[PDB]
Design a protein around this ligand. Sequence first.
Ligand SMILES: [Zn+2]
Ligand SMILES: [Zn+2]
Lengths: 307, 126, 47, 107, 67
Amino acid sequence: DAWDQDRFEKNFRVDVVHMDENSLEFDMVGIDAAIANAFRRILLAEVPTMAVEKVLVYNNTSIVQDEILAHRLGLIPIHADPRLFEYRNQGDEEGTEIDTLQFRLQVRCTRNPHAAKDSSDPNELYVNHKVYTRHMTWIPLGNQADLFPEGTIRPVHDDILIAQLRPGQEIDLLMHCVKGIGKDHAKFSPVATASYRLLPDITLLEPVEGEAAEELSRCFSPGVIEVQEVQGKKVARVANPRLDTFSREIFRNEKLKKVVRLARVRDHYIFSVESTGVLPPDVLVSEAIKVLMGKCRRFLDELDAVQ
Amino acid sequence: IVNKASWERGFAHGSVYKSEFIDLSEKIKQGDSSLVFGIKPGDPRVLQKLDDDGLPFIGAKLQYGDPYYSYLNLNTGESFVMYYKSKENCVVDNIKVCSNDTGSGKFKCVCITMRVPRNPTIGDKF
Amino acid sequence: QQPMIYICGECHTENEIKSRDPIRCRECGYRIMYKKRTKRLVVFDAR
Amino acid sequence: KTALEMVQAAGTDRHCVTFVLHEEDHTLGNSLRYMIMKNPEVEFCGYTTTHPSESKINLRIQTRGTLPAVEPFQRGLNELMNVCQHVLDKFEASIKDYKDQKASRNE
Amino acid sequence: MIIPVRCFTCGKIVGNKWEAYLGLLQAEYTEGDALDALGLKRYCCRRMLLAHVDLIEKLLNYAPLEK
RNA sequence: UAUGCGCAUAACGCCACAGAG
Ligand SMILES: [Zn+2]
Ligand SMILES: [Zn+2]
């Protein structure tokens, strides 16, 4: 049987379960594991983001040492739109307005002069004793201050604890953000995790009644088996089998392992995309589909350049 | 097998701190007993690579062949420089300077401590 | 210009040490002195 | 600069050619293998990654009659692109359906 | 030493949840309930914060300047 | 012989501990 595009467009549908900021559960119905895993792998490792690459330290008197603090700072998500920037070329130590961002972190811990009152907590004894992510100040280079409104280029989370100081200690450094894909380094990955699972279909091969219905309700996840008193006696039925986690606990009950059938619905996926905050997750899934279209267009242009 | 993305996040990252105790009396025994760490001012072998006491900066990195320390002879004037002969790039951690037991010792014992990164690579044992 | 500051191990006071003078802290006479870290550019990769 | 190498067999038939796709892994390879195996005029198709140190895949296509194995490769690329375009349209329409139903049911 | 920025296994930002975790545990929550109130659902995320030993407060008792 | 730029510097054993397979 050939590839019928019309049959695919009849049987394919997307059902959105829940979408807030930084999470998205949806369904893909009637697509194969090859393409669904392609989308999952693009979301993991090939949708580009902006992340700190070079850290120019000037003074670092903290105990969080320098090459550790650089890696520390590279793992912070930078809330930029990566589609407005470009790849820095091979060998450019100095990036321009097109392809880099700058952040200055300059925090000095001093002792709180007044209002200490011989206490013990560090929040009263010291000032700037914890270096958070709100201390990172964006340094616009070129015309980036006019291109981006104020408060747009920033880290995603302010209150990620970078380091921790004591009086006298100082962190003075400058960060350069570049664009890359998560195949290169995991700091560029835009998702917390992106994954899928096929939808389970639990069916009852035999009517289950009485205390066996309560055992059946407890051998599954809370919610899939609705045990209900129709006559006063209890019968069990499957109600929303999406909740089941395949603990397969019903296969340990010797009597009731013959009345159910756990399988999966073929080609019915449940994706979950959890953005770190760089882009909204529906935008991440759109860009992840466009990446695979770009791969196909890349090799079609290679074939047309050979011909 | 280790996940690449876990290794690229902070999984099992490390360091090793090598401390090299440098004594100009014990090793550099040429005579005259008047060697002190320092540079001859205007030396093109140590420019912006050792500090004015002939001793590397504390933030500094050390590749192979970089100047490691410089010491000058006080009764002569000639300054020597010693180069970093290890093949691993390290970052200077601290430099402590030592006297003798009386506080009368001269600027000739030092103890450089360097950090070598050593994150988990292919071939490391868990 | 730009003196070489060393920090005592005990009292943590800043000590200038030239080539010829004996090394000991000018306040407490302690024998170990740590070199001061000064502001100077070093470049690291966030990786 | 060249991402695609076409390696014909020792026979000059052009019906059994290995495609070497540089800077590529299981994503495009497995999706293309799925879309090329839908062609009735394809005798054999599989991909493999050569070594983990390298970043490329070998992709074999063997056709039956007189068509060269460049035509199923190009047709599989176009069909996978059309698949992804339709998935993009369905996904964006469903997300827009969610954002309109949600913003009006709380008001 | 210091709370990791991301979880090791998945890349979930866990570095902004250490002070929230301590404030939940001082408010007399169970550690399982305190990990639920932070939204740590996978046990990879949940061991990153459950098993974190924070050596930087012990390592800053030797703070040099003491001034 | 090695490094550095024909030139300058550095040119090892014996015990004892500890470890790897
Ligand atoms: Zn002193
Ligand atoms: Zn996790």
